[PDB]
């Protein structure tokens, strides 16, 4: 039952209902984890927290997000390989082994590109009826969040920890869920959209002067070694309100940074944006 998937990358041949699925996107994984949908193959190496049941020895190791083991994944000779953003450069080596889909978000339409994502993991799957019901809820989600946010305002800065560093990100970047979906204001409408964020020194934030600082600990979950309310938490930042309100919401980086774009990894940015929020 062969069905032709548009992608970002091409045009991929796949078959209704593969027995054999490898993995290399957390949030679709956790999407099929919501639908039900067995697979075989996922880079334990990187698995999110709460994902962390794909361990089992009962699923394959394909290596990491970053270090796909081709081999391994040879030997598997999956049925649909899925990927996204960080193996896009090797779109070719996995098409070679397997039909690939690639399932990107696009940052300027997030909402639109992670309902075509599961809608396509709807088709593939016969999960049309199940994929539709879990965008209804988030939809509803949506609906709330954005009701508390349109209450009073101030503003928001998104920003990211690695090796004491910090950037930052605003609308239509990887975080703009927070601006573009959830009404929640800008303190800067204009930072450049990249993968890893604006880098900016601490002087910048005290500017600024948010109300609301987000915070995406990334040693956390590359690392293993937390290190974001240590790198926040300093001088200049101690100035803000966002500080002297406690507004400082740390996401968490499972979610946010390792996955994203799936059924429950939505459902819970959009959960801890409302708590932080309230
Ligand atoms: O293309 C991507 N990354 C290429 C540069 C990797 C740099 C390298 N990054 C990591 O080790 C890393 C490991 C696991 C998950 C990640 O997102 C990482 O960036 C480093 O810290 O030196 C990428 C794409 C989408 C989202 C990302 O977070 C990416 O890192
Ligand atoms: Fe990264
Ligand atoms: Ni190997
Ligand atoms: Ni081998
Ligand atoms: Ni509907
Ligand atoms: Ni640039
Ligand atoms: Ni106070």
Redesign the pocket.
């Known amino acids: 039952e062969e069905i032709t998937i548009k992608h970002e990358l091409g045009e991929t041949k796949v078959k209704k209902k593969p027995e054999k699925v490898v993995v290399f996107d957390f949030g679709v994984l956790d999407s099929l984890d919501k639908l039900g949908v067995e697979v075989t193959g996922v880079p334990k190496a990187?698995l999110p927290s709460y994902l962390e049941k794909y361990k089992d020895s009962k699923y394959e190791n394909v290596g990491?997000?970053?270090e796909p083991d081709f081999e391994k994944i040879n030997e598997i000779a999956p049925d649909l390989i899925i990927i996204?953003?960080?193996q896009?450069?090797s779109y070719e080596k996995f098409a070679e082994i397997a039909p690939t889909v690639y399932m990107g978000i696009d940052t300027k339409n997030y909402i639109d590109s992670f309902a075509n994502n599961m809608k396509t993991l709807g088709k593939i799957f016969g999960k049309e009826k199940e994929v539709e019901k879990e965008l209804e809820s988030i939809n509803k989600q949506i609906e709330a969040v954005k009701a508390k946010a349109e209450k009073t305002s101030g503003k928001a800065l998104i920003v990211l920890t690695?090796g004491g560093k910090v950037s930052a990100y605003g609308p239509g970047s990887?975080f703009g869920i927070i601006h573009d979906v959830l009404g929640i204001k800008p303190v800067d409408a204009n930072i450049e959209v990249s993968?890893?964020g604006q880098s900016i020194s601490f002087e910048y934030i005290a500017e600024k002067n948010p109300d609301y600082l987000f915070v995406v600990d990334?040693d956390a979950?590359?690392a293993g070694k937390p290190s974001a309310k240590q790198t926040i938490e300093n001088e200049l930042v101690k100035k803000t309100n966002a500080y002297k309100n406690n507004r400082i919401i740390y996401l968490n980086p499972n979610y946010w940074?390792?996955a994203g774009g799936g059924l429950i990894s939505v459902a819970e940015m959009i959960n801890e944006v409302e708590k932080g929020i309230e």
């Open positions: 990187n990491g997000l970053m996204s953003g960080r896009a450069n690695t990887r993968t890893h990334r979950v590359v940074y390792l």
